């Protein structure tokens, strides 16, 4: 079979639409998500036209094999989509209405800069390669673009599913390619991070600061070192749920900065002891008293500065 | 092939039934479960009618390819079900009796609010898209809906497997869709959580309270900090077996609240030491004596309040 | 094709046999094992009968497509078995001898009560659905049931592979079903558990008891708390290699009970210190001296009681 | 199609050869490895013979479907090999030359007794089932057995790839089977184990022995207990990279024995303290002084004995 | 179908080109990467030639089945590539222009010597086996070799994608093979390693050196031992993200060397205490004062030497 012939030198417009049924498995480490949707295609093939009076029927159904169907592919998919044809319906003028149900593992990159308070735009790129007979251009039939109400992405809030109506037409290996951008806008459900990582991490830090109300070096060393190890465990736990980024993430910055607070606490604890031993407990008292205000104030201001830079 | 023709303007009724053989792999993190069942379908196709006298055979067997079979799909499956046709039997009036055995990874959401004392309703949604010739409606043949006695879901108790007999008939992309709801009611086997997480977690908390019967700051710091770290390990262990929820789970709440008890224990331990050093051991004694009653009482009441709010 | 016709109203007997080639991947958490075996089937089809004198040949070979083959399925498999036909041989009387090589992930439940000193009976269930023409019954050809000498299941000892010769004949969805039970009896190789979990766990417990020969509260607190944390690590490591059971496992019981010993050791250590501080070291001495005998004796008796209840 | 007819009563010899292209994924826990190789088969079928003068051609190419091909299977594979036919070439005498490229996950057991200083013999078993017409026997064409120079198995050294030329001819399910043994001899690259596990483990042990130059019980308890926990982490890390064996591995033995050294160090530390408190520091001094020599000497001799027993 | 006939004794040139669409999943442990690309092939088949005047058309399209297509395989792939034909176009002279879109898991080894400051050259090897009719040689059509601008490999920077234009022509199993080398040059994004592993690891080391400004043995033992354990956790974390190499990696060397610094710190701490107890605090003071300069200086020089040897 060959593509439909042009009335003039115009390209063939394949109207598209994606309707999400199930949306799942957003892997932050892999920057992938799995989708299960309907793909609808519509184009005019004058060769398929018929008189409804003479033929009796208003529409004719065909098996994929019988007629010409445009080779539509997804750009950012991992492996080729699993698709099963639901229906192919031809109207008297020759307008074909194709429908298939597919599933694919889509590879769309993520911006972890504001993690876990981040919002993402997932992409689904539809593409078509022009044949030698005629050039093929994609379009968006907005009435056939949507999502089911039940569509839930675990740990995420689905904001919108829209399509950038004007395709990206470009040359590739000396043939026209018409690319379409379907955008799924989502925002992370940060709630869990608060009682599981953020608040536990702040509690262990504040426990390290109880060393500023203690003259016992042995007890201080235990307080600051033990809590530093729990902070290492939280740093490791966090960096496992995330990929290696060439930029600093919000949680990454807080986690990093907190190491400096532990390092300075060890220095203060060491200075206090050295001074007490050197028979200068009055000077050690001044430093310890100052640290009680300095540490919370510098922590609070540094955090205001960070939140400002990141948001 | 085309769908059966109507006697009048009636829709075509496809009678359904699911009989679970094997039920397994309930992933709490993924909110998926795997199923291995029988799918039975039955509809009348007058075109397949035959005389048993002339044909020799009461029933005729056909290969799926030979006749028209309704395109029945599952809504909430991950990938398309793996199915193998067991039998297709046609009676002289044209009544088709389809049987297939399938396996699928079903995606049904879970409510972790009362975890690990939670009960779930897993869903299996059957659907059918109406063709242009005639509208297709699903039905439940209750005699062909059930589960095997051997059906075991590891770490869960299977309560019931029933079907909501009235289908959800709705419009989708300008065609009628007939959806059916099969519900598998299950309840978690919480027993293992008690000797593995709950009791170990309470033992480490009570060990931290032995600091209220000790004047040794160095020993108290070790007691409260060491047990706090074991609590962090239990928090990490628990949050690995669960997905990130936008709500507080029962175990999540207890785990969180216990951090506050560790934080207040560190404050008491610090106050006691400061006072002893400041040569006020009488005042430190009053606080320590009070804490011995306060901590268990406040822990017990807070837990009564939590159990009340959650159950 | 249709099933063989009966001489009288007798059912069709399909003689079966499974011969294990490779047995592997026993997942304790999933309660699954992978198998790679031969499946032999034998039944009489008089339509296939031939005279060896006239035909010249003693046996005739056929492709599966050419003749009727009973639809034999496995009940407790995860997905449908991967099978490849080795041979189909027909004798002059019409006796068909089918052979196929298959692989499947079998889902047979396990009893962890005596873990890691447990023995299991893995099951492979063969089933057949009766057709409308005639009822099909399964049988065991014991000469075609066995296992290869090389068959090794890592971390397990394979005791026997036998079949319960009388099939379970029952009604299902208004048709007769003939189920057969193939039993693979295995017993766990507990040896590794001794130097890796049991002995390390006992050593850390005995180290905690060196606190009964020490008057240093700070040292005792360190001894009992540090070793309690190592016991938590062993509890976590053990519960990862096992699924969540609604019953107590042998190792689970020992692990749980050892927590009580740590809890009572903390109480003794606390009492000794309180008494020493209260200027009653004589009474603290009596308690410490008693604990030296009490702890090992109660540990040894409690273990005799547990081993008795479990074995 | 039927097998080639015999000139006399001789069996049909299928000459074989395996040429490894890619060798990868050696799973120690699973005792599997993945292979990607060429399988070459050669047998004489007189029915395919032709005159090169009359036919013009020197060799004839055939599609697998066109001619009889022996059903060659792998014994110790997990699932059936993925194979794609490269070429089928017939010479004038009827000698068929088959070539296919395959990939399979091979299940060959491993001997961890000398781990990580172990050497293995991986096996690839080729087999063929005799048909009723005539018996089929395998052979090794040594010119068609080899491996690519690039063949690399990560963390292993590939020593040799040879075949045991005489097949194992035996009865199975009342038919003759001809098995062939292809052996891949490999040896572990132990280098990484030295700076990552062995030396770190020895350093922590030697740190525990600094307690023999200290009179501080509180410091000794910390030294011996802390280092014992790091040893537990190394034991856990090691037993994760390995399966549960019914025998003692070399690293397993060293790891186990080191626990005894920690246990005796705790006893010495306890004895020294008891004696110092009992006002017998002279006797405690003798024991501590002796331990300084005893511990390294007994450690060094015990290791000589172990290396001797294992190698 | 047979291969194209030669004009003379020349070999058949198959012009190739790979255009990367999606590049993903670089597994450091497995030394694999997944690719999703276009594979373009071009060769002349005079049998397919036509007159554009007489035929009307300028190019003719064919289904793969209709014409002869060279059997092109990938050498270093894990399993056979998943490919789907985009287009086959024949020009009047008989020049065939094949295009397919494929996906494969490529196995190309990595050099971890400079990790995480390493650069890699990933390889994609195209190969072709000569048939008996005529020898087949590969070529690189540079206009059909490239990569998409969007091509992103998580945690890596893609430098170049080029092809070594001269094929490696060699004999294999008595037939000519033409191999082509496609090279993807990438360099690791080391940024994340600095705040997550390197700086945390240096902070814990510097904390251990605060023991040179402390006379408290109990406190020093805690400081050096606690920080040594955190270093063990970082060593474990690092060796999990990497395979077992028969050489020393850059991070491996630093991590190893840091153990020696901990070991010497324990010796100093032990010597200081022994001397203080032996009533020689003046000599212990000299050693402690020297260590304050020695440790940072030796650490800094040793690191200069390592960076020099590795870069
Ligand atoms: C004579 C002292 C007996 C102590 C018994 C404690 C039993 C606690 C049972 C908990 C069950 C769940 C709640 C934690 C209490 C810690 C006990 C501290 C004991 C101090 C003793 C002082 C010496 C006079
Ligand atoms: C704390 C220390 C815990 C030690 C547990 C001892 C093992 C035990 O008592 O295990 C019990 C098993 C029983 O094996 P069975 O064949 O199933 O006996 C079934 C008997 N009936 C059918 C009569 C009920 O004996 C063994 O394997 C003994 C060897 C293991 C010794 C390990 C010691 C360390
Ligand atoms: Cl696609
Ligand atoms: Cl362009
Ligand atoms: Cl174009
Ligand atoms: Cl489905
Ligand atoms: Cl099956
Ligand atoms: Cl095979
Ligand atoms: Cl390939
Ligand atoms: Na088509
Ligand atoms: Na059909
Ligand atoms: Na059949
Ligand atoms: Na301590
Ligand atoms: Na064949
Ligand atoms: Na072809």
Compact summary:
Chain A has 311 residues and is of the alpha+beta class.
What does this structure look like?
Five copies of one chain form a homopentamer. Chain A is α+β, with helices and mostly antiparallel strands and 311 residues long. Chain A has two domains: 1-192, Acetylcholine Binding Protein, Chain: A; 193-311, Methane Monooxygenase Hydroxylase, Chain G, domain 1. Chain A has helices spanning 52-55, 193-208, 217-240, 250-277, 281-310; strands at 12-27, 32-44, 60-61, 72-74, 82-90, 95-107, 119-128, 136-140, 146-147, 156-171, 176-188. In chain A, a hairpin with a 4-residue loop joins strand 1 (12-27) and strand 2. In chain A, helix 2 (193-208) packs antiparallel against helix 3 (217-240), helix 3 packs antiparallel against helix 4 and helix 4 (250-277) packs antiparallel against helix 5. The radius of gyration of chain A is 31 Å and the shape is rod-shaped. Chains in contact: A-B, A-E, B-C, C-D, D-E. The interface between A and E is large, with 47 and 54 residues. Bound molecules: diundecyl phosphatidyl choline (2 copies), chloride ion (7 copies) and sodium ion (6 copies). Chains A, B, C, D, E: GO terms for molecular function: extracellular ligand-gated monoatomic ion channel activity; identical protein binding; potassium channel activity; sodium channel activity; transmembrane signaling receptor activity. Chains A, B, C, D, E: Belongs to the ligand-gated ion channel (TC 1.A.9) family.
């Amino acid at each position: 079979v060959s593509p439909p012939p042009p009335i003039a030198d115009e390209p063939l417009t394949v109207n598209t639409g994606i309707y999400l049924i199930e949306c799942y498995s957003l892997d932050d480490k892999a920057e992938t998500f799995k989708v299960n949707a309907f793909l609808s295609l519509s184009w005019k093939d004058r060769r398929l036209a018929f008189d409804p009076v003479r033929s009796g029927v208003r529409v004719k159904t065909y098996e994929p094999e019988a007629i010409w169907i445009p080779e539509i592919r997804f750009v950012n998919v991992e492996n080729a989509r699993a698709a099963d044809v639901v229906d192919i319906s031809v109207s008297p003028d020759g307008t074909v209405q194709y429908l298939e149900r597919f599933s694919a593992r889509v590879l769309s990159p993520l911006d972890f800069r504001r993690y876990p308070f981040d919002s993402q735009t997932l992409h689904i790129y539809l593409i078509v390669r022009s044949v030698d007979t005629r050039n093929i251009v994609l379009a968006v039939d907005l009435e056939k673009v949507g999502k089911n109400d039940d569509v839930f992405l675990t740990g995420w809030d689905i904001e919108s599913f829209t399509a950038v109506v004007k395709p990206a037409n470009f040359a590739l290996e000396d043939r026209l390619e018409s690319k379409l951008d379907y955008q799924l806008r989502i925002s992370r459900q940060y709630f869990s991070y608060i009682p599981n990582i953020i608040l536990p991490m702040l509690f262990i830090l504040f426990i390290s600061w109880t060393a500023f109300w203690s003259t016992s070096y042995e007890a201080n060393v235990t307080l600051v070192v033990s809590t530093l190890i729990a902070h290492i465990a939280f740093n490791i736990l966090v960096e496992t749920n995330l990929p290696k980024t060439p930029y600093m993430t919000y949680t990454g910055a807080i986690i990093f900065m907190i190491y400096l607070f532990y390092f300075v606490a060890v220095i203060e604890v060491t200075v206090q002891h050295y001074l007490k031993v050197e028979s200068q407990p009055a000077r050690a008292a001044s430093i310890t008293r100052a640290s009680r205000i300095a540490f919370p104030v510098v922590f609070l201001l540094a955090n205001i500065i960070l939140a400002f830079l990141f948001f």
